[PDB]
């Protein structure tokens, strides 16, 4: 069947995985012990869906995941937690030392000692998977394991597997907020090594989500859990068309064929519009029109960029719940009438639509309400260039004086490796300008 191998690479990735796997368990019916009481009443069913879970004859449901951090402090929170009886004990820590915010440590000195083992467990999983569609990697530009290790792994999987989909979910750095004075470099270098291997790198940022959680849900002091639960929901929309039934389903091989015109402009942005609290859950109709318009409001994005400073090249709109399609067609037409949403001349279609009948699951203890219908929008736009440019500027201001470089050279990296990277990114920025120019006859 249609199956996916989620890989969580680092702290950000593991914590997002915890969110996601809590939610998937809630959706299907799996207790943290791995047991599904749903067959207590209904025999011969399939709700512990094989895309994300594997079944033993004993009635367990073990996930298809690989967790990797190069530090024990984060997987050990699983092993000694509430989900200790679910994950296979082979959750990979050779984390005697972390990467010290260093792509050089995550790609060469401690990039190795673990990766062969990683690939072994992946091979064991894929061999159990007949109809594998792709991978979904969760990482973070800003660290080592999330910058360099991810790159190395993607390199190796583009050899050992090849014609498979390898999509990413990344926390793109913010323009103002940040937790590290070495993020720009790691970002540029990871983008250099990944642009030739990845197929679609969905991007998020935490400043945007902070602001969402402030305006709409009325949380002025949010933590990280309260953020990743949103990210979790995003994947659950991407992944619903494999798990639940629907009218128009989108497999993983249908994004990258629509949201990616040229092989290097595969950096789309996510949004999830009805991030509404239970108080404000009432006083609202929550129709398709409202949500589709919200997913195009810049203030409801999860990557801090203004689409009004650029052009949309594509947009995939994934609907969940009680949705009639006529409402989608009307909504998209309304959007195409507006002049603030300026599409390219070479994509007169622009949109893709997918629909599923299973509505979203409210995580208990949570901050989002039960909605009858939800929507996730993945949009490839030209505005993100500005963001890229910002990083490049930061890079220059540092690399002009070679700050922090002796930590990288110290861990086997040549100075030139930086320059090459920057140049490549410049090209990409130039490529974005090439796709905004109106065509001529």
């Amino acid at each position: 069947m249609r199956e996916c191998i989620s890989i969580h690479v680092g702290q950000a990735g593991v914590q997002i995985g915890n969110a996601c796997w809590e939610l998937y368990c809630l959706e299907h019916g799996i207790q943290p012990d791995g047991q599904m009481p749903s067959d207590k009443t209904i025999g011969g069913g399939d709700d512990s869906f094989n895309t994300f879970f594997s079944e033993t004859g004993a009635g367990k449901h073990v996930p298809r995941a690989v967790f990797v951090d190069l530090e024990p402090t984060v997987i050990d929170e699983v092993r000694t937690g509430t989900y200790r009886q679910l994950f296979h004990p082979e959750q990979l820590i050779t984390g005697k030392e972390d990467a010290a915010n260093n792509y050089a440590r995550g790609h060469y000195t401690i990039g190795k000692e673990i990766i062969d083992l990683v690939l072994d467990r992946i091979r064991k999983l894929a061999d159990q998977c007949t109809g594998l569609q792709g991978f979904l990697v969760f990482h973070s530009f800003g660290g080592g394991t999330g910058s360099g290790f991810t790159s190395l792994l993607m390199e190796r999987l583009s050899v050992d597997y090849g014609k498979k989909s390898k999509l990413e979910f990344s926390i793109y750095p913010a323009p103002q907020v940040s937790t590290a004075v070495v993020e720009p470099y790691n970002s540029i270098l990871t983008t250099h090594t990944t642009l030739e291997h990845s197929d679609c790198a969905f991007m998020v940022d935490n400043e945007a989500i902070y602001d969402i959680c402030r305006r709409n849900l009325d949380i002025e002091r949010p933590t990280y859990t309260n953020l990743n639960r949103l990210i979790s929901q995003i994947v659950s929309s991407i992944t619903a068309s494999l798990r639940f039934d629907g009218a128009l389903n989108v497999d993983l091989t249908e994004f990258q064929t629509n949201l990616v015109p040229y092989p290097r402009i595969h950096f789309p942005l996510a949004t999830y519009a009805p991030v509404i609290s239970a108080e404000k859950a009432y006083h609202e109709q929550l129709s398709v029109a409202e949500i589709t318009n919200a997913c195009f409001e810049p203030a409801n994005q999860m990557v801090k960029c203004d689409p009004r400073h650029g052009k949309y090249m594509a947009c995939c709109l994934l609907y969940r719940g009680d949705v009639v399609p006529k409402d989608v067609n009307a909504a998209i037409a309304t959007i195409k009438t507006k002049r603030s949403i300026q599409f390219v001349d070479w994509c007169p279609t622009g949109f893709k639509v997918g629909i599923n009948y299973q509505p979203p699951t409210v995580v208990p203890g949570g901050d989002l309400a039960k909605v009858q219908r939800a929507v996730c929008m993945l949009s490839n736009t030209t505005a993100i260039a500005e963001a890229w440019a910002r990083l490049d500027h930061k890079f220059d201001l540092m690399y002009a004086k070679r700050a922090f470089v002796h930590w990288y050279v110290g861990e086997g990296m040549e100075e030139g490796e930086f320059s090459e990277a920057r140049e490549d990114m410049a090209a990409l920025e130039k490529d974005y300008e090439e796709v905004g120019v109106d065509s001529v006859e």
């Binding site: 702290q11 914590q15 530090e71 024990p72 402090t73 984060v74 050990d76 929170e77 000694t80 005697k96 030392e97 972390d98 010290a100 915010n101 260093n102 103002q176 907020v177 940040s178 937790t179 590290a180 004075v181 070495v182 993020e183 720009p184 935490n206 400043e207 902070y210 002091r221 949010p222 933590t223 990280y224 930061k394 201001l397 540092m398 002009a400 004086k401 700050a403 922090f404 002796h406 930590w407």
Partner: protein, 429 residues
Amino acid sequence: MREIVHIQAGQCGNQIGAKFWEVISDEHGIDPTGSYHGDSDLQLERINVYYNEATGNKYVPRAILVDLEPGTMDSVRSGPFGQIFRPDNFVFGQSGAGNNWAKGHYTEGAELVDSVLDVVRKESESCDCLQGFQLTHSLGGGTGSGMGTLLISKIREEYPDRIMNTFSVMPSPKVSDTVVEPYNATLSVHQLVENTDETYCIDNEALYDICFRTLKLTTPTYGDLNHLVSATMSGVTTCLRFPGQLNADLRKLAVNMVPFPRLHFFMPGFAPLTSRGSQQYRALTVPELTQQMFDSKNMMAACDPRHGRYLTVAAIFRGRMSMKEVDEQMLNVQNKNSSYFVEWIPNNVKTAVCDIPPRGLKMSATFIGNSTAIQELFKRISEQFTAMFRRKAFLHWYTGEGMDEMEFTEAESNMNDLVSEYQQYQDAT
């Protein structure tokens, strides 16, 4: 298993460390005998950072104590928490240094560094993965400075890929306690700047001000100052020994806080301090800790950051808190006070958060700053140095123990060059 091997040399070093072990025993639930008498389980998950198991659920620390005279060693034993140290790790000889660097580096200390290195190799090969070392010593005397610097040299030769952090009481501007502070400090700088990876500079006037105008203590003994230094020592290495939302070991801190290899001298600080009566008048939240941590009155270095600019600042938080608060408030610091931050480093801030705070507080924070104002320290020493070296004030006690004026000139040159590095990032262009 990221493990630390802790050395401590001299009077200051041993007293601070003893007060440190009485502070990391209280956090980890160890008693003066070695036994666990705790509440939680997380106290024991990561105790291996500092301690080793022995037999009966007794925990013997990885302390290496060093003195050139046995007077300070007998006080740790004949004291609260001395019956937990391994007696074979009290390496001490006679023939004190005499508040002289030479007697600690060349004459008497060279007759004892081999012993210390043996104890190290024992307490470093019994470790699954070592993250580094940490020494508590004192620039101002002979034994601490001398023997410590020598050991640094020898470990950075034998263990080069590892951390060598340092907590050093630097001399103070107004009043001294030795008449040969300058020389010894200059030579110790010469031997640290080339070897260490983090040097946390402490100054006792800052701590007395803290004990006077913040804690409002009328009788500030040294046991109180060491209780402030221990607080920072613990804060720096929390995230290796308790979980958190966003972690930060030592090497990460160094990578973020050390742009060029020699400017690894840090002004530290700890928040929150409330004097015992201003407790009920103060709210415990991030804005307050930030207001205190970035104030010049909470820093231990005796150097006003307002006379310079912050190359790189680091904030290790402990408690349940929102990350938005941290990020927002840090950006606010950088924006409102842009004149005190470098322009060619866009974000000058590093953040870490741990979940398990200190025993009596809901929130705690440690601050490590790399600023240019550290020049004001070394500059002064150089002035002192040359005001003596021009007249051979006290050098015959040094030459008599196998030294040459060349080393003095060398050290002066190095320290002045360091001052110049920190100067070139002081003006705004």
